[PDB]
Amino acid sequence: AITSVDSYLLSEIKPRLNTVLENCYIIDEVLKDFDYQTRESFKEAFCGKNAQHEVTVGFNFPKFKNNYEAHYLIQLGQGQETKNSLGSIQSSYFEATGDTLVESSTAIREDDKLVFTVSKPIGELIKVEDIEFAKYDNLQVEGNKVSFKYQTNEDYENYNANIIFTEKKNDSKGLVKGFTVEEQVTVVGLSFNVDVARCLDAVLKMILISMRDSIEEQQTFQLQNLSFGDIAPIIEDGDSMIFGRPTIIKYTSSLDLDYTITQDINKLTFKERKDWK
Amino acid sequence: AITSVDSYLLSEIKPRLNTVLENCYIIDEVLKDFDYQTRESFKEAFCGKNAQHEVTVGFNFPKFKNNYEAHYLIQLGQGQETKNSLGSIQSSYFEATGDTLVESSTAIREDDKLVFTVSKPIGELIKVEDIEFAKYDNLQVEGNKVSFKYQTNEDYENYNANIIFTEKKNDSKGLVKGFTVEEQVTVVGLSFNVDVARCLDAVLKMILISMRDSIEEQQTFQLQNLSFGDIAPIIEDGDSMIFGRPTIIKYTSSLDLDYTITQDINKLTFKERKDWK
Amino acid sequence: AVEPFPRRPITRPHASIEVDTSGIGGSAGSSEKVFCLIGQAEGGEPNTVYELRNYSQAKRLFRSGELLDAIELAWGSNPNYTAGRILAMRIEATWADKLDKFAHEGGYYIVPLSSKQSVHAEVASFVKERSDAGEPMRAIVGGGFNESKEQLFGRQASLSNPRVSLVANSGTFVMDDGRKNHVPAYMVAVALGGLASGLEIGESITFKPLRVSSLDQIYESIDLDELNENGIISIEFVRNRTNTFFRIVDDVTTFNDKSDPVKAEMAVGEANDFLVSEDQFIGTRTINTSASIIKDFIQSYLGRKKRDNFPAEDVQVIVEGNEARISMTVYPIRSFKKISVSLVYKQQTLQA
Amino acid sequence: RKKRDNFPAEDVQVIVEGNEARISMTVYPIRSFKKISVSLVYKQQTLQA
């Protein structure tokens, strides 16, 4: 589809940043290389549930005064289309199929079948966690239900699995048209304290490494690549300098549209028409 | 792990700079190429235990007035990720294993074994200095103790050795994920005296050569590379010019995380379920 | 176990021999399907289970009674098969306390020599109590001298159990004394139990003959189908030939279900009661795994083995809680009940 | 090279100390048997003719 790396990053960094900063030993492991006093000061200031200081995230032109003790600025950069397919045909499909999902689900007993139930109608199922079925298991999917033969499998009547699938829009024929784009977003950890800046750098690098295994960039925002500027004053004429070290995050993804085709041929009918010449 | 070349350099230069400057004949050897008067003046000013002038090190935005007779400024530069592994899998391990260490240790007699004792629990041992053991020596490591058969070896009951090893965090399965980064730090020897600047240049080049054999960059901050700017005025509108010659130090290292996996398969159990078709 | 020689340990200088006998042990095969009877007799000591090995011994212990006629039929229906052991007990009302005595006598089929439905229910309960234990059993029962189809259906429904079969027909057997002995249908059940005991493990009594002189009732094809579908065994008088004979239509069971052969058909139930069922590599040798690579590994292994000596569609893998269960499908030997022939008439150009 | 013309790496120990290197080989002397342990396995074999 059409996608926006800035919205992806903003949506993804915030929970990850929260979950790291609520978890002291992670920071203690991230900041193991830094000086003891730097580490302890940052941990006591920003880290753990008692921490009163907090780190904030937002876009680059707010009208209000931001946090400047510790803030992450996300800033949509340049981008360029890099590789084209013949005819722009990126793919083609017999069913309009949306995002991929992962859900936790459990087996439940219908008197003929175990069923795993999914929040949405399933367009295709990719995995049931640590199950490989045989034909005897009579694996079948229908709507929002994944169904699985009970008769041998009562020992798994409440087995807990993660379902990897993708939603269905509708059963229709179509083509997916567009090209790959190589695109950048700059991020900078603003702080009026240089050592805070350097910690926010380390924390953001850790977060961005961890994001490489997330399904979002794994499917779509592939080939994450990181570059870093010097640490420098962003603003140098207040009562104190505001410092930051920019990092640039580059991605590859496909911009494309679902081009449906309503034409199809249902039947071939053969005639012989005779020419007397 | 996550690492910071600026903290490494600051932590490493200071002791090395002290130990050179406390040792006159080293400077006399370093400055052998310079003019006699330059050499003698610098030696009398800054060098040997009687010296009253001193050379200082710090980061680039202090709020106080630095030393300007002789100072080393350390300044975190640009960097870029350069090489990736497939899947980002940099390595994988069956035991979470920390820094490498070197310690001095001595044999001590238990009534069955000589033992070398180490400050920390040992995750792996790499060397015992100038010992190659046979199977007959029954070399075994356990916790913080390296143990070594006594029965033939009473002639070495107090042998003095250097132990090269690495600490253990815990016995757990996991993977190490990330990429190599190519990264720069600029250093400049500030002085209001040009000849002092040129000596601080020579001394820093010597220190940086000597650091190439240190275990820190040998393991992790590999491929040290040096570039140098012109000698120029840094500040030109005081009562005197402050001069410096910048050098840029470039390194290669891995930024990576310990991704542990709790999943493992302990047992395989085989069933035959019979199909009457 | 491995035997030490000497048995006593020794510490002074000596030799000792350890003998592995385990490469020679045998007799691990099955029991035979010993047959069991309970009923009236003279002479024998009541409520004592006797092993019998030939009819002379039977007439020596038991006399002058229907149990000895039963033993006769039990060896007379199968003259072209092994005349195996029989277990029999004179019973002089509850029958469970007597049936308990068979509990540790190793016999697989039982028939009570009675048509009373209480008896049949007791026997079914006993067969259940044994077969849910480590020692499987089955029973066969029959009606009186002539019962209607609706009576037989009512009886089967009341006695509907996956280890009991009802036989409908009754008739006349020529005994070895020459007597034309008219008998109730439960003696025909004794005859079928004898045949089933004589047949191999997981052979089936369908389309086997019955050496009977006449039947009290002859059922036409629709009645044979009715009884078969209701899980009642019936005997066909084969009339399509000058060599007429009597044929056991099927080995159906009073529990009838299309969804499970093992409970519907006696022979496959017996096979399941007698069938026999038949390498590890541990995750420390690898950094991480999944059911997909477990499946592909075990497929590569069994591919190598079957090349030296299995379909990927027929192995299932589940991993749970550090444990992986690998489940193969396997195919047991059944017996044909249907043959479908498609006959196509073509025509051909000859030329000369 | 010598044993090719005429030793296991697991059976030589080296210690270097104070400009001196001691190389220590293991060697195996001739003892005399005090124990004999016989494991006797009965197999069986199919003959055919």
CB A172 within 8 A of CB A123: no
CA-closest candidate to residue C30, choices C165, C202, C253: C202
Specify the 3-state DSSP secondary structure of A106.
Answer: strand
Could you identify the residue written with the tokens 């494309």?
A256
CA-closest candidate to residue A230, choices C316, D33, B79: B79
What distances in angstroms separate CA C122 from CA B208, C103, C157, C160, C197, one per listed residue? 98, 14, 15, 13, 22
What distances in angstroms separate CA A126 from CA A99, A141, A157, A164, C122, one per listed residue? 12, 11, 21, 5, 54
| B262 reaches C (C-beta below 8 A) | no
* Pairwise CA distance, residues C74 & C195, whole Å: 7
Q: Name the token pair of C123.
A: 């026997």
Q: 10 Å Cβ neighbour count for C16?
A: 15
Specify the 3-state DSSP secondary structure of A271.
Answer: coil
* Pairwise CA distance, residues C89 & C192, whole Å: 19
Interface test with B, best of D12, D16, D17 (most B CBs within 10 A): D17
Residue C8 makes CB contacts below 8 A (sequence gap 6+) with: none
CA-closest candidate to residue C37, choices C3, C86, C79, C73: C86
What distances in angstroms separate CA C295 from CA A211, C139, C325, C326, D18, one per listed residue? 30, 44, 11, 8, 59
Q: Do chains B and C touch (3 or more CB pairs under 8 A)?
A: yes
List of chain A residues whose C-beta atoms are within 8 Å of the C-beta of residue C291: 130-132
Q: 10 Å Cβ neighbour count for A160?
A: 12
* Pairwise CA distance, residues C308 & C301, whole Å: 11
CA-closest candidate to residue A26, choices A210, A266, A269, A233: A210
Contact criterion met (CB < 8 Å) for C15 and D34: no
Specify the 3-state DSSP secondary structure of C104.
Answer: helix
Question: Which chains have 3 or more CB–CB distances shorter than 8 Å to chain B?
Answer: A, C, D
Q: After which residues is chain D broken (C to N over 2.5 A)?
A: 6
List of chain C residues whose C-beta atoms are within 8 Å of the C-beta of residue D44: 23-24
φ, ψ of residue A275 to 5 degrees: the values are -110, 115
* Sheet of strand C3-5, all strands in order from the earlier edge strand to the far edge: C3-5, C14-20, D35-41
Elucidation method: cryo-EM
* Pairwise CA distance, residues A44 & A199, whole Å: 13
Question: Which run of H or of E encompasses A14?
Answer: helix A5-21
| C323 reaches A (C-beta below 8 A) | no
CA-closest candidate to residue A117, choices A95, A143, A94, A87: A143
Question: Which run of H or of E encompasses A107?
Answer: strand A96-109
Question: Which run of H or of E encompasses A196?
Answer: helix A194-211
φ, ψ of residue C115 to 5 degrees: the values are -95, -5
CA-closest candidate to residue A25, choices C134, C351, C347, B170: B170
Rounded to the nearest 5 degrees, what angle is found at the Cα of B67, between the Cα atoms of B62 and B73? 60
CB D4 within 8 A of CB B146: no
CB C227 within 8 A of CB C152: yes
* Pairwise CA distance, residues C210 & C245, whole Å: 8
Amino acid at B125: L
Contact criterion met (CB < 8 Å) for B132 and D26: no
Contact criterion met (CB < 8 Å) for B264 and C283: yes
Q: What is the CA radius of gyration of chain B?
A: 26
Pairing of strands B267-274, C323-330: parallel
* Pairwise CA distance, residues C203 & A239, whole Å: 100
| C317, closest residue in chain A (CA to CA) | A132
Name the DSSP letter for residue C42.
B
Q: 10 Å Cβ neighbour count for C170?
A: 25
| A227 reaches B (C-beta below 8 A) | yes
* Pairwise CA distance, residues A166 & A177, whole Å: 20
Cis peptide, bond prior to residue C184, ω within 30 of zero: no
List of chain B residues whose C-beta atoms are within 8 Å of the C-beta of residue A31: 2
Question: What is the nearest CA distance from C18 to chain D, expressed in angstroms?
Answer: 5
What distances in angstroms separate CA A2 from CA A5, A7, A131, A225, B107, one per listed residue? 10, 12, 34, 21, 68
Could you identify the residue written with the tokens 């406390």?
B22
Question: What is the nearest CA distance from C288 to chain B, expressed in angstroms?
Answer: 7
Neighbouring C-alpha atoms within 13 Å toward the C-beta of B55: 30
Amino acid at B98: G
Question: What is the nearest CA distance from D49 to chain C, expressed in angstroms?
Answer: 22
Q: 10 Å Cβ neighbour count for A78?
A: 11
φ, ψ of residue C336 to 5 degrees: the values are -60, 130
**Among the residues of chain C, which ranges form H helices?**
55-61, 66-76, 96-99, 117-131, 149-158, 185-198, 221-229, 261-264, 266-274, 291-308
- DSSP code per residue over A203-215: HHHHHHHHHTTSH
* Pairwise CA distance, residues C326 & C316, whole Å: 6
Question: What is the nearest CA distance from C108 to chain B, expressed in angstroms?
Answer: 23
Contact criterion met (CB < 8 Å) for B130 and D24: no
Residue C129 makes CB contacts below 8 A (sequence gap 6+) with: none
Q: Is the dihedral of CA B11, B13, B16, B20 positive or negative?
A: negative
| D11, closest residue in chain B (CA to CA) | B134
* Pairwise CA distance, residues C71 & C20, whole Å: 46
| D23 reaches B (C-beta below 8 A) | no
Our CA dihedral for C120, C124, C125, C131, rounded to 10 degrees, sits at 160
List of chain C residues whose C-beta atoms are within 8 Å of the C-beta of residue A152: 327
Per DSSP, what are the bridge partners of residue B188? Answer: B73, B246
Contact criterion met (CB < 8 Å) for D44 and C24: yes
CB A260 within 8 A of CB A254: no
* Pairwise CA distance, residues C249 & C232, whole Å: 10
φ, ψ of residue C220 to 5 degrees: the values are -80, 170
Residue B171 makes CB contacts below 8 A (sequence gap 6+) with: B94, B95, B96
SS3 per-residue string spanning chain B: CCCCHHHHHHHHHHHHHHHHHCCHHHHHHHCCCCCHHHHHHHHHHHCCCCCCCCCEEECCCCCCCCCCCCEEEEEEEEEEEEEEEEEEEEEEECCEEEEEEEEEEEEEECCCEEEEECCCCEEEEEEECCEECCHHHCCEEECCEEEEECCCCHHHCCCEEEEEEEEEEECCCEEEEEEEEEEEEEEEEEECCHHHHHHHHHHHHHHHHHHCCCHHHHHCCEEEEEEECCCEEEECCCCCCEEECEEEEEEEEEEEEEEECCCCCCEEEEEEEECCC
CB A137 within 8 A of CB A149: yes
Contact criterion met (CB < 8 Å) for A233 and B61: yes
Q: Do chains D and A touch (3 or more CB pairs under 8 A)?
A: no
Produce one character per residue of B83-113: b if its CB has 16 or more CB atoms within 10 Å, e if not: ebeeebebeebeebbeebbeeebebeeeeeb
Question: Which chains have 3 or more CB–CB distances shorter than 8 Å to chain A?
Answer: B, C
Amino acid at C173: F
* Sheet of strand C86-90, all strands in order from the earlier edge strand to the far edge: C49-52, C86-90, C35-39, C109-112, C138-142, C164-167, C232-233
For chain C, how long is the longest CA-to-CA vector? 99
* Pairwise CA distance, residues B276 & B50, whole Å: 99
Q: How far is CA C21 from the centre of its chain?
A: 35
Our CA dihedral for A208, A212, A214, A219, rounded to 10 degrees, sits at 130
Produce one character per residue of B137-174: b if its CB has 16 or more CB atoms within 10 Å, e if not: bebebeebbbbbbbeebeebeebebebbbbbbeeeebb
* Pairwise CA distance, residues B172 & C145, whole Å: 78
Q: 10 Å Cβ neighbour count for C234?
A: 24
CB C38 within 8 A of CB C120: no
Q: Is the dihedral of CA B93, B98, B102, B107 positive or negative?
A: negative
Q: 10 Å Cβ neighbour count for A163?
A: 20
* Pairwise CA distance, residues B173 & C285, whole Å: 12
Q: Is the dihedral of CA B18, B21, B23, B25 positive or negative?
A: positive
* Pairwise CA distance, residues A258 & A174, whole Å: 7
Amino acid at C290: S
* Pairwise CA distance, residues C58 & C41, whole Å: 11
Specify the 3-state DSSP secondary structure of A224.
Answer: strand
CA-closest candidate to residue B190, choices B202, B198, B179, B178: B198
Our CA dihedral for B131, B136, B137, B139, rounded to 10 degrees, sits at 100
List of chain C residues whose C-beta atoms are within 8 Å of the C-beta of residue A137: 316
CB C165 within 8 A of CB C188: no
CB A59 within 8 A of CB A10: yes
- Taking phi over 0 as left and psi of -120 to 50 as alpha, with beta for the rest, B45 belongs to alpha
CB B67 within 8 A of CB B75: no
Q: Do chains C and A touch (3 or more CB pairs under 8 A)?
A: yes
Instruction: Find the length of chain A.
Output: 277
* Pairwise CA distance, residues B160 & B164, whole Å: 13
Per DSSP, what are the bridge partners of residue B131? Answer: B128, D15
* Pairwise CA distance, residues C342 & C82, whole Å: 39
Question: What is the nearest CA distance from B140 to chain C, expressed in angstroms?
Answer: 21
| D20 reaches B (C-beta below 8 A) | no
Name the DSSP letter for residue A238.
S
Pairing of strands C35-39, C315-320: unpaired
Our CA dihedral for C252, C253, C258, C261, rounded to 10 degrees, sits at -80
Question: Which run of H or of E encompasses A219?
Answer: helix A215-219
What distances in angstroms separate CA D18 from CA B109, D15, D21, one per listed residue? 21, 10, 8
Specify the 3-state DSSP secondary structure of A122.
Answer: strand
Q: Is the dihedral of CA A97, A98, A102, A106 positive or negative?
A: negative
Amino acid at A248: I
Produce one character per residue of A121-134: b if its CB has 16 or more CB atoms within 10 Å, e if not: ebbeeebbbbbbbb
* Pairwise CA distance, residues B129 & A64, whole Å: 63
Produce one character per residue of B124-133: b if its CB has 16 or more CB atoms within 10 Å, e if not: eeeebeebeb
* Pairwise CA distance, residues B190 & C303, whole Å: 73
Specify the 3-state DSSP secondary structure of C203.
Answer: coil
φ, ψ of residue C120 to 5 degrees: the values are -60, -40
CA-closest candidate to residue C153, choices C69, C98, C250, C229: C229
Given D10, D14, D24, which is nearest B135 (Cβ)? D10
SS3 per-residue string spanning C206-265: CCCEECCCEECCCCCHHHHHHHHHCCEECEEEECCCCCCEEEECCCECCCCCCCCHHHHE
CA-closest candidate to residue B183, choices B252, B113, B256, B82: B252
* Pairwise CA distance, residues C63 & C76, whole Å: 18
Question: Which chains have 3 or more CB–CB distances shorter than 8 Å to chain D?
Answer: B, C
Given B132, B135, B156, which is nearest D14 (Cβ)? B132
Contact criterion met (CB < 8 Å) for C261 and B276: yes
CB B17 within 8 A of CB B55: yes
Amino acid at A79: G
Instruction: Find the length of chain C.
Output: 352
Produce one character per residue of B196-219: b if its CB has 16 or more CB atoms within 10 Å, e if not: bbbbbbbbbebbbeebeeeeebee
* Pairwise CA distance, residues A27 & A50, whole Å: 15
Question: Which run of H or of E encompasses A16?
Answer: helix A5-21
* Pairwise CA distance, residues C85 & C66, whole Å: 18
Given A132, A134, A136, which is nearest C292 (Cβ)? A132
- DSSP code per residue over D5-37: H---GGGEEEEEETTEEEEEE---------EEE
- DSSP code per residue over C289-308: --HHHHHHHHHHHHHHHHHH
CA-closest candidate to residue A74, choices A25, A9, A133: A9
Question: Which run of H or of E encompasses C325?
Answer: strand C323-330
Q: How far is CA C309 from the centre of its chain?
A: 33
Given B4, B255, B273, which is nearest A34 (Cβ)? B4
- DSSP code per residue over A144-177: TEEEEE-TTTGGGTT-EEEEEEEEEEES--EEEE
Question: Which run of H or of E encompasses A198?
Answer: helix A194-211
Residue A90 makes CB contacts below 8 A (sequence gap 6+) with: A176, A177, A178, A179, A254, A256
| A213 reaches C (C-beta below 8 A) | no
| C283, closest residue in chain B (CA to CA) | B265
